[PDB]
Amino acid sequence: QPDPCSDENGHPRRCIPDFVNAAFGKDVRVSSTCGRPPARYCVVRLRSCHLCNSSDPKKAHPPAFLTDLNNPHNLTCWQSENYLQFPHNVTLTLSLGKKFEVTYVSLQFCSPRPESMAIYKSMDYGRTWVPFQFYSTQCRKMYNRPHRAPITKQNEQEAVCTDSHTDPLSGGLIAFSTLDGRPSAHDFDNSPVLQDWVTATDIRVAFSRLHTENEDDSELARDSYYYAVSDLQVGGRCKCNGHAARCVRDRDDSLVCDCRHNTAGPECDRCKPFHYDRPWQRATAREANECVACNCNLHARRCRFNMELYKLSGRKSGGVCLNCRHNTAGRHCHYCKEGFYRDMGKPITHRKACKACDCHPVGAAGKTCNQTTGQCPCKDGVTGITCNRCAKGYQQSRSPIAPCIKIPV
């Protein structure tokens, strides 16, 4: 069970959390639940009505039932409140509290499937919602949607209406594939819009009309106007952009990717401090697109990225250093500032590879060193890096203006 982000040889490798039913176990918020106050429900010569009493445990159908274990034997099932009018839309809302890549959303009913329902998603933690899938026989009437609309390479963030659900009365499932039907699911791994389509922080499914005049017209309701669902599932992985092997509870229970590849953020959607030599790209299966640290030769704490710099190279590197501290300067603090010179004995990384100009006042003709070698501008007859000694064939005078005069012969 090795590190999935760490390739063999300690290298980077794209990594994504286990695929899960994110709904499982989690508490779902339903607009209507039978049992409060207790009331009998007929179950349709099929009329065998039983009691839904919320208090009475063995005869209750709470929303908890929606998500717990479902085995055909001793199966368990939530049930909406009864005698629904027509205008109704009964809603189940699920809040993951983290961005997810959802592959499917599936419900299994104990009641007959709705004639109209609609799946929604929140990308924004519950403030606004988006059409995900529509199900109805009368598409244009109920949801104002073309029936079985086509999905071009454009307009493939389209939430379609379909009669697929209409096929049953004793129960049965209706499941929604997010990727199915889209043209660009060939290579989702590098699809910018399908990677956005399959993202949700909350999920909401809203039944809006039941499967019913022959007896008595179309108006008032009866014991059998209710919905029941046994198992809700949203299948998908935690949204980590491939830079994390799992999600996990942060400080203060805000579930978040355990980020890797020198990425940070809740979705690993960015690079980690001082790791800005390369732009944050989402990890594909080909290149793990980790965040490589800029290089400052140990003379800068902070760092910055320039995209031109990246583009101007072979898309190799674009990092930049800030306030080079040890009398260094340059993009990478690579060279020694004016007024100093590269101490060649120390290595550039060393705190003190930049040494100062204690050049000779009389000897040298200037104050500033060569910024590599240290050589000061020697007066005509003086030699040395400091210009602190007369060339051979010259004699030291007491004069500051000119020491080291020519001996002739």
Ligand X SMILES: *[C@@H]1O[C@H](CO[C@@H]2O[C@@H](C)[C@@H](O)[C@@H](O)[C@@H]2O)[C@@H](O[C@@H]2O[C@H](CO)[C@@H](O)[C@H](O)[C@H]2NC(C)=O)[C@H](O)[C@H]1NC(C)=O
Ligand Y SMILES: *[C@@H]1O[C@H](CO)[C@@H](O[C@@H]2O[C@H](CO)[C@@H](O)[C@H](O)[C@H]2NC(C)=O)[C@H](O)[C@H]1NC(C)=O
Ligand Z SMILES: *[C@@H]1O[C@H](CO)[C@@H](O)[C@H](O)[C@H]1NC(C)=O
Q: Given the rule CB under 6 A, which residues bind ligand Y?
A: 366, 370-372, 375, 377-378
Given ligand Z, Sm ion, ligand Y, none, residue 215, with its beta carbon under 5 to 8 Å by kind, binds Sm ion
Residue 56 or 250: the one with the smaller Cβ distance to ligand Z is 56
- Residues 125 and 96: their CA atoms lie apart, in Å, by 8
- Beta carbon of residue 8, minimum distance to ligand Y (angstroms, whole number): 43
Given ligand X, ligand Y, its own copies, none, residue 89, with its beta carbon under 5 to 8 Å by kind, binds ligand X
Give the long-range contacts of residues 67-70, CB within 8 A, separation 24 or more. 67/23, 67/24, 67/25, 67/26, 67/27, 67/28, 67/231, 67/232, 68/25, 70/108, 70/230, 70/231
Residue 38 or 171: the one with the smaller Cβ distance to ligand Z is 38
Residue 164 or 306: the one with the smaller Cβ distance to its own copies is 306
Q: Between 30 and 69, how does the x/- string for binding to ligand X read (CB under 6 A)?
A: ----------------------------------------
Q: Applying CB under 8 A, which of residues 247, 379, 386, 390 lies at the interface with its own copies?
A: 379
Does the footprint of ligand Z cover residue 53 (CB under 6 A)? yes
Q: Applying CB under 6 A, which of residues 65, 143, 197, 335 lies at the interface with ligand X?
A: 143
Given ligand Z, Sm ion, its own copies, none, residue 189, with its beta carbon under 5 to 8 Å by kind, binds none
How many H helices and E strands in the chain?
Answer: 3, 26
Annotate 116-132 with b (16+ C-beta within 10 A) or e (fewer): bbbbbbbeeeeeebebb
Residue of this chain nearest to ligand Y (CB atom):
377
Q: How many CB atoms lie within 10 A of CB 248?
A: 12
Q: List the beta bridge partners of residue 206.
A: 91, 118
Interface residues with Sm ion (CB under 5 A)? 7, 18, 65, 68, 70, 76, 215-216, 230
